Amino acid sequence: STINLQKAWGAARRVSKDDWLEWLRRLSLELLKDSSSPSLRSCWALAQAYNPMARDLFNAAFVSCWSELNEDQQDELIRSIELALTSQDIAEVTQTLLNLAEFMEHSDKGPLPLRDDNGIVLLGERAAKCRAYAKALHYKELEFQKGPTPAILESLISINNKLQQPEAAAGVLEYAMKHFGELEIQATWYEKLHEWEDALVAYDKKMDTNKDDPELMLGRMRCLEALGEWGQLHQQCCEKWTLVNDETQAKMARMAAAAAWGLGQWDSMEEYTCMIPRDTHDGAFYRAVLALHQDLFSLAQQCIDKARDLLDAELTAMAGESYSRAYGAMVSCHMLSELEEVIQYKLVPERREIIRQIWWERLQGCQRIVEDWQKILMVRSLVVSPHEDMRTWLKYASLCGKSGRLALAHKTLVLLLGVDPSRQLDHPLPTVHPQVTYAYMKNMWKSARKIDAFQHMQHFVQTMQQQAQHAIATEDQQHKQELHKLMARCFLKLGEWQ
Amino acid sequence: XXXXXXXXXXXXXXXXXXXXXXXXXXXXXXXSTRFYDQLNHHIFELERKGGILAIASLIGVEGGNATRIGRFANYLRNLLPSNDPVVMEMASKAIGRLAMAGDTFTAEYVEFEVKRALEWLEGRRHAAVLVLRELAISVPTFFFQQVQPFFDNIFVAVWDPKQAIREGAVAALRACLILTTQRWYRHTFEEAEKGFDDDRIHGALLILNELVRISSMEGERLREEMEEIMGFGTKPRHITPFTXXXXXXXXXXXXXXXXXXXXXXXXXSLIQMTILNLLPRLAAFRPTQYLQDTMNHVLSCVKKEKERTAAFQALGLLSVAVRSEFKVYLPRVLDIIRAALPPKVDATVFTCISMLARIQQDIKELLEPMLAVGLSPALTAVLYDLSRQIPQLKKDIQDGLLKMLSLVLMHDVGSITLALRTLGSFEFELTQFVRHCADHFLNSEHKEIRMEAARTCSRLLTPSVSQTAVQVVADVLSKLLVVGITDPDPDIRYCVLASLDERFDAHLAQAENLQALFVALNDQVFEIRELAICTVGRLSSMNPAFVMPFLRKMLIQILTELEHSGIGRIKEQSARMLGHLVSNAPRLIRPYMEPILKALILKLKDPNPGVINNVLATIGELAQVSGLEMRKWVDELFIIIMDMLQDSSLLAKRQVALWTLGQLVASTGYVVEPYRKYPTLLEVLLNFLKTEQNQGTRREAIRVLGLLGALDPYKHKVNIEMLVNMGNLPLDEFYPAVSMVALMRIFRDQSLSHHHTMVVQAITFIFKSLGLKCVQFLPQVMPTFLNVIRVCDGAIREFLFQQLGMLVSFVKSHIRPYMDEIVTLMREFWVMNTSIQSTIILL
Amino acid sequence: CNPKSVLKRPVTSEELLTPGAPYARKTFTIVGDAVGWGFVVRGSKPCHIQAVDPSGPAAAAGMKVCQFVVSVNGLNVLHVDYRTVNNLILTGPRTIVMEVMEELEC
Ligand SMILES: O=P(O)(O)O[C@H]1[C@H](OP(=O)(O)O)[C@@H](OP(=O)(O)O)[C@H](OP(=O)(O)O)[C@@H](OP(=O)(O)O)[C@H]1OP(=O)(O)O
């Protein structure tokens, strides 16, 4: 009772999906026929006509057989199991054999020994391509327990990010810091963890000692665009163009255009966007943006449709494995449909205040991540200066503060105020746009300039109450109601600060 | 249509037969299945051209199906072994149309034809060649599956003494080597040069040319263009309407070709034709000894006849490739052209004179015979493209060309057709002509003259301040409107009406023209009616005092036909008509939006697909026009659309469903809140991405995920045992438990209705092998097993009662709790039927 | 440092105008695309081509970076600003007729 089995093992002449699926079906039914326990052997006839029955008894048939085999047949089997996973792997066959390996771990018999170490390396790699990230993690943790290596830690980090567990990945970096120090920690690890401040420090330390390399340049530029330091990012571009190859050129322009757009230099942006490949989502998006800058409405819509077409591949892949992975694509679709509502905003003066209200309600449903907000606000800034909509950029400044990026929060608020109070320390704060000024003071308090903040607040409230009294007419009643709602919050801050 | 369908079948069996095959294809566009298979079989066995016309046309339109593929495959497999010419190429076209259908059997059908084509490699050999050529064009992937057999068998079969194979098999090698270059070359050059060392000439020259031609498209792109011979700044409408080896062998490809062309200069018409095609493309790769062997064959073939057409095409490529050195043979070529033209073939001569410029002041003297040849579509295409590339005397070109047209139009039928096509194709500088053209169209009984003279005048009125000129334009356009109303031939009426563009709206807005246009809104042809109601809606800004009362009357009538006519077609046409008003007259419709929208929602809650599709396209167009006044009705509209999106049962297309939903979310500004109200929205819209195959639809399904915003993942979370069995038990218990669990799953639902006997037998054998330990499983087995006996039918009943008896014999005393139900079962299903009585008595 | 300059040749005025010698003129007719032509002209006096998309239609039909243009869609633009040419190409038809200086490796 091991001739047909050994044919099904050492066949390996399968060059399609249904061929391996046929191998599975023949394997399962031969295990049922073999199976010593007659309760399983009786189900063989049903399993033939109906496939679900064969698959539900797969793990039980296997254990029954694998226990009977006198070691030699187990090696014949295990060798065939190794070959099937390693070569000509089919998703459906794999996740069957992964569920078999997991069932075997929970069994008293113990895990099947494949290619030494019970295949802790093979089954992990296979579960990763199956996108079974919890199995991948379990197996990668078993490998870590046996020994700690930098490669293992890297893979552990990437597994955690795919599984939407940011805190665990951060813990892996803390382990690396203690036991390996700093040299073993690559900058890419910070990049994966969204530690853009520490990644820039790492890329600066690396680019000082080691000679400048394409890889470390793009890594540091990627950190600068995530932080939003468009000044430094555009300086690195202008300095290094002829010094760079055409392969890195295509990996550069996507970041160089973002920097030019941020600074508002449209000539530079046109040069960079042409260097971006058309096949990429971003290449279509940035061409569609330079369309709306030049009022090429007809071409913009064309470019947007190709952009959606190229986002097909991304949206489908991410949606397959949880909504959380699909969020990145969802933000891309957000920006595409916002570019459609910039064409309307530039064509319909009657629609303007409606569009702004829609924009405001949409941004509040979107997640409070600063990267996502910066993207969206940069798009809307194509036709709406920050002064024409304060509340958007104030809520933005709030997020920057609470996410521990007070430098960006400060820049944002200075841009809204109109001048720098930081420079003119002796002067009083400007009273025009009082909601902005108030936000600046409560930022200054968080920056531990709390004696100065308190003094500014006393000056401001005296100004407010005098600006109310003298300007109170019957006309401005909604304005007066907003001015009192402000003054009230000012008085409360005064108290708690005192 | 049965009797009449077989009547027109023999009529198409015995121009007229192509118009009946196009009518049968048009009848298949709207549209039993057995009678169409019998009617196809009736035409098949009888004649063979009409049978191929019946097979291929139906499969493409009615759609390939497993039934239709299995049947018609036998018909196609019978025709190929032995057939006549012409019918064979029609049957090969029916293969190409079947192979591009995009069905699951296409993989089998294509590889069946390809494998049998390799077996052959004369109605057998040329059939396999036509199969391989069309499959190489239509299906590159499965054609690439057998490339090593392809080259080896074909380099043997090509060099057999045949002409039809040499024409097609080299074109198959063309389709193959293009796919190889974009992604063999040594095996091609070896077998080609072996063949060169008069049947073995014109094939080798084409193979060497393939390495030259594919490596350099510059030679082919001139021939490809001569064989065939809006704006980005426009503002979109505010309401969106619904929608190496070939370079290192190329030198040997010309060296082994500049000898064949010099040797086989006049051996065994066909060889000279392929030589004069290849020689210029080889010279365009690398131009003096190579030129002298080319020039001797080309120049000698120009003086001769039956080649003069292809000779100038080769000569035009040679003139562009060899720039300076060709200038020596200018007096020879130009003397032959000056001798060739006086007889009036020369339609190509002008095309190549255009490629000669593609220059000197001598051409000015060359114009006086050129124009004296006569009006041809090549000549005026040349002189137009001549003034494009070399605009040295564009004024002198138009002077002579208008003088030619004036001599013509001062003075049979097909020439007047082409003379009007000329007069209306490209720009010109025409008042008397048009007032005389106002006489010709009225006083011509020829449909094609009227239809072309209409196309011409509508094109020639693009220059549209002196009062007399306005009164003339007003007169002509009044005559045109009269023709557009009164002409019997609706094609002529459609052309004229379609030609009254935005350009004329200054004239159409005149009182007299508007009184005509109103009459036109009651035209017999719905399409003209649509186009007329669009024009009046577009003019509602120019003269609203007149237009708005009339569109109101029309709106009432449209909504009357919608609500009160109980007919699919009329209602479908009425919605479409209401469509054109919303888009073209949004100001008029805005005050009446709440009445219209209530009428449309009532149509959506009525218990034909095209009616619902046009109603959805109108509601979508109303969204943008409403301008935030439709918010109150947003909730009702959303519920209806969501009910219709889920499932494919609904006749209405998902595309327009998703499009109108887009337009509502966009204009009304319902964002984030719809996600809370309808939580399955994100599950519906991510299901289309895994189901829909259309691009347009997938684009909308994305554009709607865009407008609705990107929901935070947490906000979406708010908006929304077998291993355990083994974890506990020992294995000897586990195996029954897992067997039982697996059998119980199948037991419930209609799965049992198929695997009834098998499931029941397994459960019994398990209980017998266990003994009295099966008592454990009783509470699982019994309630299901009893409900199975209740709802089982026919023969299965008896078997179940037999197996229940076995069960009871094993369970013994433990069956007491369920005994009461069993008795009730027996009491209900005891009948005088002898069979069940013996069964129950045993139980 | 905000502008970028990729042209080695400092000035070509009064050198192109002279017939013959360093270059041989060629006319390249470029058809529009769904996403754009993909070329940029940033020459003050001569309007030299700034960059070309390698995957775009222009790169397929020659159109190398180191080139100079003097006429677009018929109109001669030998002496105009680069920005003015950018207005003409956008306001013109989808298909653009372009003349490239195409210096012969000198
Ligand atoms: O961070 P805080 O100092 O406690 O300030 C909060 C915070 O305002 P910011 O937008 O400046 O951060 C709240 O906003 P959230 O981040 O929680 O959304 C805001 O609440 P609203 O968003 O409802 O306006 C609230 O304002 P209020 O006191 O009117 O409820 C305001 O408090 P203070 O102005 O008193 O500091």
XYZ file of N, CA, C and O in Angstrom, chain A residues 37-40 42-43 45-46 49-50 53 56-57 59-60 63-64 67 99 102-104 106-109 295-299 302 305-306 308-309 311-312 315-317 319-320 323-324 326-327 330-331 333-334 336-337 340-341 344 347-348 351 354 358 361-362 365-368, chain B residues 231-236 238 624 627-628 631 665-673 675 682 686 689-690 695 698-700 702-717 722-723 726-727 731 734-736 738-739 742-743 745-746 751 755 758-759 762 765-766 769:
536
model
N -7.792 3.916 10.354
C -9.070 4.129 11.030
C -10.229 4.010 10.048
O -10.315 4.805 9.103
N -11.132 3.040 10.227
C -12.165 2.796 9.209
C -13.196 3.905 9.104
O -13.828 4.038 8.047
N -13.393 4.694 10.164
C -14.269 5.858 10.078
C -13.811 6.825 8.993
O -14.638 7.458 8.327
N -12.498 6.953 8.798
C -12.000 7.748 7.680
C -12.036 6.968 6.371
O -12.438 7.513 5.337
N -14.066 4.853 5.413
C -15.433 4.786 4.909
C -15.824 6.032 4.124
O -16.723 5.959 3.279
N -15.178 7.166 4.384
C -15.529 8.426 3.742
C -14.875 8.594 2.377
O -15.079 9.630 1.734
N -15.379 7.129 -0.555
C -16.284 7.192 -1.700
C -16.934 8.565 -1.814
O -17.037 9.122 -2.914
N -17.386 9.125 -0.689
C -17.978 10.458 -0.707
C -16.953 11.506 -1.126
O -17.271 12.433 -1.879
N -16.633 11.946 -5.104
C -17.648 12.748 -5.782
C -17.622 14.197 -5.306
O -17.734 15.124 -6.117
N -17.477 14.413 -4.002
C -17.522 15.746 -3.413
C -16.150 16.083 -2.841
O -15.666 15.396 -1.936
N -15.350 17.277 1.227
C -15.174 16.203 2.200
C -13.722 15.740 2.257
O -13.180 15.504 3.345
N -11.601 18.459 4.126
C -11.868 18.581 5.556
C -11.195 17.473 6.358
O -10.838 17.685 7.522
N -11.014 16.297 5.762
C -10.345 15.180 6.415
C -8.857 15.107 6.097
O -8.212 14.115 6.455
N -6.072 16.734 7.173
C -5.146 16.668 8.301
C -5.278 15.361 9.070
O -4.276 14.833 9.569
N -6.495 14.823 9.181
C -6.691 13.598 9.949
C -6.198 12.374 9.188
O -5.599 11.471 9.781
N -2.193 12.486 9.478
C -1.680 12.009 10.760
C -1.832 10.497 10.878
O -0.910 9.799 11.317
N -3.000 9.967 10.501
C -3.211 8.523 10.560
C -2.173 7.778 9.728
O -1.575 6.798 10.188
N 1.660 8.347 11.049
C 1.986 7.569 12.241
C 2.328 6.126 11.890
O 3.263 5.548 12.456
N -1.564 24.644 6.565
C -2.525 24.209 7.573
C -2.239 22.790 8.048
O -2.611 22.430 9.170
N 0.735 23.338 10.573
C 0.229 23.914 11.815
C -0.515 22.870 12.637
O -0.329 22.776 13.857
N -1.378 22.088 11.985
C -2.062 20.993 12.668
C -1.062 20.020 13.279
O -1.289 19.484 14.370
N 0.056 19.784 12.589
C 1.069 18.862 13.091
C 1.815 19.435 14.291
O 2.262 18.677 15.159
N 0.360 21.373 16.612
C -0.539 21.218 17.751
C -0.655 19.766 18.193
O -1.117 19.503 19.308
N -0.249 18.826 17.345
C -0.353 17.407 17.646
C 0.755 16.970 18.597
O 1.821 17.588 18.675
N 0.486 15.887 19.332
C 1.497 15.323 20.220
C 2.688 14.786 19.438
O 3.810 14.762 19.957
N 2.460 14.337 18.200
C 3.530 13.757 17.395
C 4.660 14.757 17.174
O 5.839 14.383 17.170
N -4.042 75.162 -17.106
C -5.448 75.221 -17.505
C -5.760 74.289 -18.673
O -6.687 74.542 -19.445
N -4.998 73.206 -18.812
C -5.279 72.187 -19.825
C -6.301 71.194 -19.271
O -5.988 70.060 -18.900
N -7.553 71.655 -19.212
C -8.608 70.852 -18.599
C -8.834 69.551 -19.361
O -9.032 68.494 -18.752
N -8.813 69.612 -20.696
C -9.084 68.423 -21.500
C -8.025 67.353 -21.269
O -8.341 66.163 -21.156
N -6.759 67.765 -21.198
C -5.665 66.819 -21.005
C -5.634 66.302 -19.572
O -5.314 65.131 -19.335
N -7.965 63.374 -19.203
C -7.287 62.244 -19.832
C -6.258 61.620 -18.892
O -6.252 60.403 -18.674
N -7.719 59.680 -15.909
C -8.231 58.347 -16.217
C -7.109 57.318 -16.325
O -7.218 56.214 -15.776
N -6.023 57.648 -17.031
C -4.853 56.772 -17.003
C -4.314 56.583 -15.590
O -3.838 55.495 -15.244
N -6.098 56.552 -12.795
C -6.985 55.548 -12.221
C -6.673 54.162 -12.775
O -6.612 53.183 -12.023
N -6.452 54.072 -14.091
C -6.101 52.807 -14.734
C -4.850 52.178 -14.128
O -4.793 50.958 -13.938
N -3.719 52.786 -11.089
C -4.074 52.452 -9.716
C -4.895 51.169 -9.611
O -5.038 50.640 -8.503
N -5.440 50.669 -10.725
C -6.106 49.368 -10.741
C -5.263 48.296 -10.059
O -5.721 47.628 -9.125
N -4.890 49.008 -6.165
C -6.125 48.886 -5.394
C -6.532 47.428 -5.221
O -6.945 47.016 -4.130
N -6.427 46.635 -6.289
C -6.835 45.234 -6.226
C -5.969 44.447 -5.249
O -6.482 43.676 -4.430
N -4.650 44.626 -5.327
C -3.741 43.850 -4.487
C -3.933 44.175 -3.009
O -3.998 43.271 -2.168
N -6.599 45.584 -1.511
C -7.936 45.249 -1.028
C -8.066 43.766 -0.709
O -8.867 43.384 0.152
N -7.294 42.921 -1.396
C -7.386 41.487 -1.183
C -7.090 41.055 0.240
O -7.668 40.079 0.728
N -8.841 45.788 4.759
C -9.073 47.186 4.410
C -7.884 48.067 4.771
O -7.605 49.046 4.067
N -7.188 47.747 5.867
C -6.118 48.611 6.361
C -5.011 48.784 5.328
O -4.483 49.888 5.156
N -5.485 48.572 2.140
C -6.101 49.316 1.048
C -6.163 50.815 1.315
O -6.432 51.578 0.381
N -5.940 51.247 2.560
C -6.046 52.665 2.898
C -5.117 53.523 2.048
O -5.498 54.621 1.621
N -6.744 54.082 -1.114
C -7.894 54.947 -0.859
C -7.496 56.419 -0.800
O -8.229 57.288 -1.286
N -6.337 56.718 -0.210
C -5.861 58.097 -0.166
C -5.496 58.581 -1.564
O -5.688 59.758 -1.894
N -7.042 57.628 -4.331
C -8.328 57.958 -4.936
C -8.911 59.248 -4.375
O -9.578 59.990 -5.104
N -8.688 59.521 -3.087
C -9.056 60.813 -2.516
C -8.448 61.965 -3.309
O -9.150 62.900 -3.711
N -7.201 61.963 -6.344
C -7.682 62.005 -7.722
C -9.022 62.726 -7.825
O -9.193 63.624 -8.658
N -9.983 62.349 -6.981
C -11.296 62.983 -7.001
C -11.264 64.415 -6.485
O -12.172 65.193 -6.799
N -10.419 66.423 -9.546
C -11.630 66.666 -10.324
C -12.400 67.870 -9.792
O -12.966 68.645 -10.571
N -12.433 68.042 -8.471
C -13.103 69.180 -7.851
C -12.238 70.434 -7.781
O -12.683 71.438 -7.213
N -13.714 71.926 -11.359
C -14.985 72.601 -11.108
C -14.771 73.938 -10.410
O -15.406 74.940 -10.760
N -13.831 76.522 -12.816
C -14.821 76.820 -13.844
C -16.112 77.433 -13.325
O -16.741 78.207 -14.050
N -16.531 77.110 -12.106
C -17.839 77.533 -11.605
C -17.682 78.449 -10.396
O -17.599 77.966 -9.258
N -20.063 77.753 -7.525
C -19.940 76.502 -6.789
C -18.883 76.571 -5.690
O -18.641 75.570 -5.010
N -19.639 75.911 -1.860
C -20.054 74.519 -1.711
C -18.838 73.600 -1.691
O -18.722 72.713 -0.836
N -17.580 70.948 1.254
C -17.329 69.539 0.957
C -15.909 69.153 1.356
O -15.685 68.156 2.050
N -15.536 68.823 5.183
C -16.151 67.615 5.727
C -15.394 66.355 5.325
O -15.335 65.396 6.103
N -14.816 66.335 4.123
C -14.067 65.164 3.670
C -12.786 64.975 4.475
O -12.461 63.857 4.890
N -13.295 63.301 7.911
C -13.462 61.859 7.853
C -12.165 61.109 7.628
O -11.995 59.993 8.128
N -11.238 61.700 6.879
C -9.942 61.085 6.642
C -9.125 60.998 7.931
O -9.320 61.761 8.881
N -8.201 60.039 7.947
C -7.401 59.756 9.131
C -6.431 60.900 9.413
O -5.999 61.619 8.507
N -6.088 61.061 10.691
C -5.341 62.204 11.201
C -3.827 62.069 11.033
O -3.080 62.689 11.799
N -8.865 70.384 -29.449
C -7.828 71.158 -28.788
C -7.724 70.790 -27.326
O -8.707 70.387 -26.696
N -6.514 70.933 -26.782
C -6.286 70.637 -25.373
C -6.805 71.741 -24.462
O -7.138 71.474 -23.301
N -6.884 72.972 -24.961
C -7.375 74.089 -24.185
C -8.875 74.255 -24.144
O -9.363 75.202 -23.520
N -9.627 73.367 -24.789
C -11.077 73.489 -24.809
C -11.654 73.217 -23.424
O -11.242 72.282 -22.732
N -12.612 74.044 -23.022
C -13.265 73.863 -21.733
C -14.315 72.762 -21.827
O -15.204 72.834 -22.682
N -14.244 71.735 -20.981
C -15.265 70.682 -21.010
C -16.628 71.223 -20.606
O -16.746 72.232 -19.908
N -20.014 71.892 -18.752
C -20.216 71.974 -17.309
C -21.072 70.824 -16.788
O -20.884 70.385 -15.648
N -26.160 67.324 -11.206
C -25.317 68.495 -11.427
C -26.162 69.747 -11.636
O -25.804 70.832 -11.164
N -27.917 71.691 -8.306
C -27.167 72.663 -7.537
C -27.541 72.781 -6.072
O -27.787 73.890 -5.587
N -27.625 71.644 -5.376
C -27.857 71.521 -3.928
C -29.320 71.669 -3.536
O -29.616 71.757 -2.335
N -31.148 67.901 -1.979
C -30.638 67.241 -0.780
C -31.731 66.452 -0.070
O -31.473 65.367 0.464
N -23.218 61.919 -5.158
C -22.200 62.173 -4.138
C -21.404 63.433 -4.461
O -21.097 64.238 -3.572
N -21.071 63.633 -5.736
C -20.230 64.762 -6.123
C -20.953 66.088 -5.916
O -20.488 66.955 -5.167
N -22.094 66.264 -6.582
C -22.769 67.558 -6.566
C -23.362 67.859 -5.194
O -23.077 68.907 -4.602
N -24.193 66.953 -4.674
C -24.884 67.212 -3.416
C -23.941 67.272 -2.223
O -24.288 67.887 -1.209
N -22.769 66.654 -2.313
C -21.810 66.746 -1.230
C -22.125 65.839 -0.063
O -21.962 66.245 1.095
N -22.580 64.618 -0.332
C -22.840 63.633 0.716
C -21.586 62.785 0.884
O -21.351 61.841 0.126
N -20.774 63.123 1.886
C -19.485 62.484 2.117
C -19.406 62.054 3.575
O -19.888 62.765 4.465
N -18.838 60.866 3.807
C -18.604 60.289 5.133
C -19.914 59.801 5.742
O -20.013 58.649 6.178
N -20.921 60.673 5.784
C -22.211 60.277 6.342
C -22.854 59.107 5.606
O -23.435 58.240 6.282
N -21.423 56.548 4.372
C -20.738 55.358 4.867
C -21.349 54.862 6.172
O -21.528 53.654 6.361
N -18.837 50.065 1.441
C -17.438 49.738 1.183
C -17.255 48.278 0.786
O -16.286 47.946 0.095
N -15.691 47.573 -3.033
C -14.528 46.703 -3.155
C -14.856 45.340 -3.750
O -13.931 44.576 -4.044
N -14.346 45.728 -7.789
C -12.951 45.629 -8.202
C -12.515 44.182 -8.391
O -11.595 43.911 -9.171
N -13.153 43.240 -7.696
C -12.835 41.832 -7.883
C -13.738 41.141 -8.896
O -13.475 39.986 -9.246
N -13.288 48.287 -18.205
C -12.430 49.349 -17.694
C -13.256 50.550 -17.251
O -13.125 51.017 -16.113
N -14.877 49.797 -13.940
C -13.859 49.815 -12.894
C -13.377 51.232 -12.602
O -13.092 51.571 -11.449
N -13.300 52.082 -13.629
C -12.904 53.472 -13.412
C -13.930 54.204 -12.556
O -13.573 54.931 -11.622
N -15.214 54.027 -12.868
C -16.268 54.642 -12.068
C -16.258 54.108 -10.640
O -16.313 54.882 -9.677
N -13.867 53.210 -9.033
C -12.787 53.900 -8.336
C -13.147 55.361 -8.095
O -12.971 55.883 -6.987
N -13.644 56.043 -9.130
C -14.027 57.446 -8.998
C -15.058 57.656 -7.893
O -15.107 58.733 -7.287
N -15.869 56.640 -7.596
C -16.846 56.783 -6.521
C -16.208 56.521 -5.160
O -16.585 57.151 -4.165
N -15.228 55.617 -5.089
C -14.436 55.497 -3.869
C -13.624 56.757 -3.610
O -13.310 57.069 -2.456
N -13.271 57.486 -4.665
C -12.606 58.767 -4.532
C -13.483 59.840 -3.920
O -13.115 60.451 -2.913
N -14.644 60.084 -4.536
C -15.504 61.178 -4.095
C -15.994 60.956 -2.672
O -16.055 61.898 -1.873
N -16.351 59.716 -2.337
C -16.811 59.394 -0.993
C -15.721 59.552 0.061
O -16.015 59.415 1.253
N -14.482 59.826 -0.342
C -13.402 60.019 0.600
C -12.775 58.702 1.013
O -13.250 57.613 0.689
N -11.673 58.808 1.752
C -10.989 57.639 2.294
C -11.349 57.526 3.770
O -10.941 58.361 4.583
N -12.110 56.490 4.106
C -12.577 56.310 5.472
C -11.435 55.836 6.363
O -10.606 55.018 5.954
N -11.392 56.360 7.582
C -10.414 55.893 8.551
C -10.694 54.424 8.877
O -11.861 54.038 9.022
N -9.661 53.576 8.987
C -9.924 52.143 9.227
C -10.692 51.858 10.507
O -11.541 50.958 10.524
N -10.414 52.596 11.584
C -11.166 52.412 12.822
C -12.637 52.758 12.625
O -13.524 52.009 13.050
N -12.911 53.904 11.998
C -14.287 54.280 11.689
C -15.000 53.199 10.885
O -16.220 53.041 11.006
N -14.264 52.447 10.063
C -14.868 51.341 9.329
C -15.098 50.125 10.214
O -16.044 49.365 9.981
N -14.254 49.927 11.228
C -14.498 48.863 12.196
C -15.733 49.160 13.038
O -16.488 48.245 13.389
N -11.870 22.109 14.256
C -11.182 20.853 13.975
C -9.839 20.787 14.690
O -9.492 19.757 15.282
N -9.070 21.876 14.645
C -7.867 21.974 15.464
C -8.209 21.959 16.949
O -7.468 21.390 17.760
N -8.856 18.380 17.983
C -7.623 17.637 18.217
C -6.858 18.161 19.425
O -6.195 17.380 20.117
N -6.923 19.471 19.674
C -6.330 20.039 20.877
C -6.728 19.331 22.157
O -5.963 19.317 23.127
N -6.254 10.593 19.589
C -6.446 10.441 18.151
C -7.506 9.397 17.825
O -8.196 9.518 16.805
N -10.600 11.312 18.259
C -10.589 12.414 17.298
C -11.069 11.993 15.913
O -11.807 12.736 15.255
N -10.658 10.809 15.445
C -10.983 10.427 14.070
C -12.483 10.250 13.856
O -13.001 10.760 12.846
N -13.231 9.547 14.716
C -14.700 9.607 14.590
C -15.257 11.020 14.658
O -16.081 11.403 13.817
N -14.012 13.933 13.959
C -13.786 14.747 12.768
C -14.550 14.189 11.572
O -15.032 14.947 10.721
N -14.668 12.862 11.477
C -15.487 12.263 10.426
C -16.941 12.704 10.544
O -17.560 13.119 9.557
N -17.466 16.329 9.661
C -17.373 16.536 8.221
C -18.613 16.025 7.498
O -19.013 16.596 6.478
N -19.232 14.959 8.008
C -20.462 14.460 7.404
C -21.648 15.360 7.729
O -22.537 15.550 6.890
N -21.730 18.559 8.087
C -21.696 19.749 7.241
C -22.464 19.525 5.943
O -23.328 20.327 5.570
N -22.149 18.437 5.237
C -22.824 18.130 3.978
C -24.306 17.869 4.210
O -25.146 18.231 3.377
N -26.940 20.336 -0.577
C -25.797 19.511 -0.954
C -26.135 18.033 -0.812
O -25.690 17.199 -1.609
N -25.659 14.111 -2.799
C -24.803 13.097 -2.196
C -25.522 12.412 -1.039
O -24.930 12.102 -0.003
N -24.488 8.439 -0.299
C -23.119 8.311 0.188
C -23.011 8.780 1.636
O -22.393 8.112 2.472
N -23.596 9.941 1.946
C -23.469 10.514 3.285
C -24.080 9.579 4.323
O -23.485 9.317 5.375
N -22.038 6.298 5.102
C -20.828 6.515 5.886
C -21.156 6.652 7.368
O -20.447 6.105 8.222
N -21.876 3.149 8.875
C -20.686 2.317 9.031
C -19.838 2.788 10.207
O -19.230 1.975 10.913
N -19.778 4.104 10.421
C -19.066 4.658 11.570
C -19.676 4.148 12.870
O -18.965 3.691 13.774
N -18.948 0.402 13.471
C -17.565 0.156 13.863
C -17.268 0.647 15.276
O -16.425 0.061 15.966
